[PDB]
């Protein structure tokens, strides 16, 4: 070896697809009590593998993959009630730094404050 072009000396040894793993959408900012939400997840680059998704929160959120973007994977999920939802997506164990990501859901609170919705 002799990269020096990083991609290996980068630091986090690339960790693998952890770099091509892209995830950006509105469902990646907030959700509402029992309201269908979704976000995009582009991939198809590192190569075949697995994608584990550990969700945690006051309720079990649903998940729905939809290949309808010409290239971006649409993962539609559904939250049940406000709180701090946490998801961990890893492409073949390539857990992105964000994972565990955070998805604050709000019931007519758009914020669910520990003083308004008071928990």
């Amino acid at each position: 070896g002799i990269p020096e072009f990083f991609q290996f000396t980068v630091g986090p040894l690339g960790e693998g697809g952890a770099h091509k793993v892209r995830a950006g959408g509105t469902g990646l900012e907030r959700g509402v009590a029992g309201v269908p939400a979704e976000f995009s997840i582009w991939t198809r680059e590192a190569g075949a593998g697995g994608l584990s998704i550990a969700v945690e929160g006051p309720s079990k959120a649903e998940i729905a993959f939809e290949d309808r973007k010409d290239g971006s994977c649409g993962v539609s999920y559904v939250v049940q009630e406000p709180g701090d939802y946490e998801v961990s997506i890893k492409f073949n164990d390539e857990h992105i730094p964000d994972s565990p990501f955070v998805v604050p859901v709000a019931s007519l609170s758009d914020d669910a404050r520990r003083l308004t919705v008071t928990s």
Binding site: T43, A48, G49, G50, L51, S52, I53, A54, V55, E56, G57, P58, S59, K60, A61, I63, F65, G83, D84, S119
Partner: peptide, 24 residues
């Protein structure tokens, strides 16, 4: 306060990308 219940509820599910037999 001290949330008596340990953390909130938990959930675990996922899938995997495994296209048909490679033949490209």
């Amino acid at each position: 306060m001290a949330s008596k219940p340990e953390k909130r509820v938990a959930s675990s599910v996922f899938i995997t990308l495994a296209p048909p037999r490679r033949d490209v």
